[PDB]
Amino acid sequence: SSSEIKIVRDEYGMPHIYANDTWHLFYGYGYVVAQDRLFQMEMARRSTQGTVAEVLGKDFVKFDKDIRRNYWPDAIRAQIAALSPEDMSILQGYADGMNAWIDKVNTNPETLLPKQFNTFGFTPKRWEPFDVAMIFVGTMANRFSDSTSEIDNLALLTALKDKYGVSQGMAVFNQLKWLVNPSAPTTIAVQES
Amino acid sequence: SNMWVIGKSKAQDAKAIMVNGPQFGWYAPAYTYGIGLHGAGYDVTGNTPFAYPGLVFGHNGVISWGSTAGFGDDVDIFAERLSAEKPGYYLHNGKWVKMLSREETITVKNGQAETFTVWRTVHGNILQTDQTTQTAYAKSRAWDGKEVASLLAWTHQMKAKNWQEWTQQAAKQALTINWYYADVNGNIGYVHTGAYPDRQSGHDPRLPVPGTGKWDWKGLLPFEMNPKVYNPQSGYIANWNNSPQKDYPASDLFAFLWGGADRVTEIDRLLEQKPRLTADQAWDVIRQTSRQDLNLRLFLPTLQAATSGLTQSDPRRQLVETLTRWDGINLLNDDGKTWQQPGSAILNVWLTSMLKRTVVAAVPMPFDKWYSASGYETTQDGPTGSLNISVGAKILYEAVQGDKSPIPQAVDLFAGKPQQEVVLAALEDTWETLSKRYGNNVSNWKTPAMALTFRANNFFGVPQAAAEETRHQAEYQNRGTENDMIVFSPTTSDRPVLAWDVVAPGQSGFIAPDGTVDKHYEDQLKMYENFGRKSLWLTKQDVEAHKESQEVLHVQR
Ligand SMILES: O=C(O)Cc1ccccc1
Ligand SMILES: [Ca+2]
């Protein structure tokens, strides 16, 4: 069947999802993630959207403000809205899968609720496609592809010019923060390109 | 993050071998999540960070893929021109343009709420403003508006069956990331993926540009421009966040450089060493590189030359002889807390002293603090990520190369003194410092080993577990957060593919309300520490053969 989602766990607990369509396949994935890593995922959702002070307090206000100032939520929603129904299924399947398991947990918290929700004094909320997308955006795009120190570099360069004068300040800048160095060991050999 | 890919011509008893060690820090519960997907055109196995829809590490029985951080320059800062009167406007192409703005309310558990505004221009969100210059800085990313497409390219690539299909997906991944390929036929490939700006002529990407119009990027460079290799003449592909290719410019980070001193050399040495490598040998490179001091190789010749005319009773000469006798591989003593040889401690003190006398001296305060680290960092919990050669150390290496270095020495870092005299002065400092703490008998120096901590707070510094959930490993290992190996066409099996991984502490982070920990909460922790690994299953018969449980759902959209 098309309604059927079979979940097989191996000797390490690693889940394997058997499904006939995209929505059912990502629903299965979403479901096991909510089983295995709900507190982690929940904290990862608040970290990537800047909503930690709500449950954790005063100490995270600066963190929350810094996260919100580094993205444009509306630009992310517009990319979601432009997806094709097959692409959209991935994200919707996933959020739906998670929600299915959050509903049972929230229904039977005396045995299903992750101990840390009790510790931290809050409970899990339902997910939407925007939340799934933000997990990737916040931990892959901001943590590994958002690197610059240009303002700082300018500050440094300005200090080298008041020390060595204008032309000298610039040549020292090139010695400390060169653009390229032809002796750098490379992944692609020079014969290749 | 490191990777080594071995093709047909370098592989022994297989056609292709892929070993990946993504480095993201050590966390409890595991940074990555193990998952197999079978249906809707997908047939994959692997693990991926934060259980993203697409698997960063894994294979589909035909091809295998992996990644390492790219570090290309894909972000530039635009100095936006503001008017004192007419606020929330900026000058662009001779018109006063209005900024996008949004208000935000930060709700605070047990405190008052807080609201602020976020501003944005054509170039990007505003970082900071200088109302004295009447300048606002906007951070411009080449991948702005392709975030979602990058996620989907990472998902769709799992279905590729060849290089041709695989690169159609690589062309849509817009973040600066290295992608790797291997297949059942022994083919191997590499692509430095990402969206890079087509800059205006005379744009120096290390420094801000005016955002008034003339400095605006021309667009984005085509994918034909992205560094890539297929079936390289060497038989292998190695990367440890080094330069992709000759003359490729790195990130603008002051602290990031691609120079003659690079930790990828440590991988290359080992792969060129043996004409062919087996899977056990390819796996074994993790153990060696985990334990290798990264500075020994770079400065041993320099220290040797400087102490050559010194006497045997000279302590500065003794210290160099200790290092000469050493292979650079750190091993713990029986005590589980100290290293067998004092090499790293010596290089650490020497290097700190050397930096203070050379690079630090040439830079004005407080910029001098950026170049003073030796790269031996750590605290009690050990390093937060990988060990690397510090920026100051890469700059000092070029200086000690003298004229063999391609980098013009605008200021002589040795400030008119012969090299040997600065080296010997730092060696005197070293001896004075270390002998004071450990005594005069170098042979009984029991130096402190670095440790490994699986942190309860995620990389943002936000709790993702209870503090008590923190795990400790005695030996610091400069390796992936996870390690995975894929072997295509083993001669050793009937199986066309064999794959292994390790996801520590375990698959599950579940703790029941009563304090009852899941069965798979920490069953991979000891395996991690002793360089072990678990089989990854793809086919139904393997999965069936190894099943521990089954759950069937009947759901309709
Ligand atoms: O190299 C890194 O810092 C970690 C990493 C691995 C794979 C992809 C992105 C980042
Ligand atoms: Ca830049």
Domain ranges of chain B: 1-72+146-290+452-536, 73-145, 291-451
Domain boundaries, chain A: 1-147, 148-193
User: Looking at beta carbons, which residues of chain B come within 8 Å of A77?
Assistant: none
CB A90 within 8 A of CB A96: no
Distance CA B185, CA B149 (A): 30
| B496 touches B184 (CB < 8 A) | yes
Closest residue on chain B to A41 (Cα)? B50
Q: What is the resolution of this structure in A?
A: 2.5
Task: Note whether B204 and A174 are within 8 A (CB).
Answer: no
Rg (CA), chain B: 26
**Nearest-angstrom CA–CA distance, B447 and B393:** 22
**DSSP bridge partners of B535:** B500
Bridge partners of B460, per DSSP, are none
* Whole-Å CA distances, A19 to B20, B52, B84: 29, 18, 61
CA distance A46 to B458: 12
If one counts every other C-beta atom within 10 angstroms of the C-beta of residue A155, the result is 13
CA distances from B335 to B330, B408, B473, B530 (A): 14, 48, 14, 17
Respond yes or no on whether the N-terminal peptide bond of residue B366 is cis (omega within 30° of 0): yes
Contact B455, B27 (CB under 8 A): yes
Whether the CB-CB separation of B244 and A168 falls below 8 Å is answered with: no
CATH number for the domain whose boundaries are A148-193:
1.10.287.150
Q: Measured from the CA of B241, which atom of ligand 1 is nearest?
A: 1
DSSP-derived 3-state class of residue B230? strand
The residues with which B239 forms a beta bridge, in sequence order, are B3
Element (H, E) at B350: helix B343-357
Give the type of residue at A42.
E
Cβ of B40 under 8 Å from any chain A Cβ? yes
Regarding the domain delimited by A1-147, which CATH topology (the fold level of the hierarchy) does it fall under? Answer: Penicillin Amidohydrolase; domain 1 (1.10.439)
* Superfamily designation of domain B291-451: Aminohydrolase, alpha-helical knob region (1.10.1400.10)
B22 CB near ligand 1 (under 6 Å): yes
Residue with tokens 């703005």: B101
**Amino acid type, A44:** A
The verdict on the CB of residue A72 being under 6 Å from ligand 1 is no
Provide the pairing of β-strand B75-81 with B209-210: parallel
Calculate the CA B99 to chain-centre distance.
36
Rg (C-alpha) for chain A, rounded Å, is: 24
Contact B111 A41 (CB under 8 A): no
Whether B374 is catalytic = no
Using DSSP bridges, classify how beta strands B42-49 and B32-39 pair: parallel, antiparallel or unpaired.
antiparallel
* Distance between Cα B56 and ligand 1 center (Å): 10
Hey, what are B493's tokens?
């099996």
Cis peptide before B29 (omega within 30 of 0): yes
- On the question of a cis peptide bond just before residue B383, with omega within 30 degrees of 0, the verdict is no
| Dihedral class, residue B212 (left if φ above 0, else alpha if ψ from -120 to 50, else beta) | alpha
Task: Pull the structure tokens for residue A173.
Answer: 């800048």
DSSP class of B511:
B
Method: X-ray
3-state secondary structure of B145: coil
User: What CATH number was assigned to the domain covering residues B73-145?
Assistant: 2.30.120.10
CB atoms near residue B84 (< 10 Å): 7
Cβ atoms B39, A17 nearer than 8 A: yes
The CB density around residue B278, as the number of other CB atoms within 10 Å, is 18
Does the CB atom of residue B1 touch ligand 1 within 6 A? yes
Chain B contact set for A184 (CB, 8 A): 242-243, 258-260, 262
User: B464: which chain A residues are within 8 Å (Cβ-Cβ)?
Assistant: 39-40, 43-44
SS (H, E, C) chain A: CCCEEEEEEECCCCEEEECCCHHHHHHHHHHHHHHHHHHHHHHHHHHHHCCHHHHHCHHHHHHHHHHHHCCCHHHHHHHHHCCCHHHHHHHHHHHHHHHHHHHHHHHCCCCCCCHHHHHHCCCCCCCCHHHHHHHHHHHHHHHHCCCCCHHHHHHHHHHHHHHHCHHHHHHHHHHHCCCCCCCCCECCCCCCC
A167 burial class (0-12, 13-18, 19+ CB within 10 angstroms)?
Answer: exposed
| CATH superfamily ID and name for B1-72+146-290+452-536 | Aminohydrolase, N-terminal nucleophile (Ntn) domain (3.60.20.10)
8 A C-beta contact, residue B144 and residue A72:
no
Which residues in B295-413 belong to E strands, given as ranges? none
Sheet holding B114-120, edge to edge: B100-106, B114-120, B125-130, B135-141, B75-81, B209-210
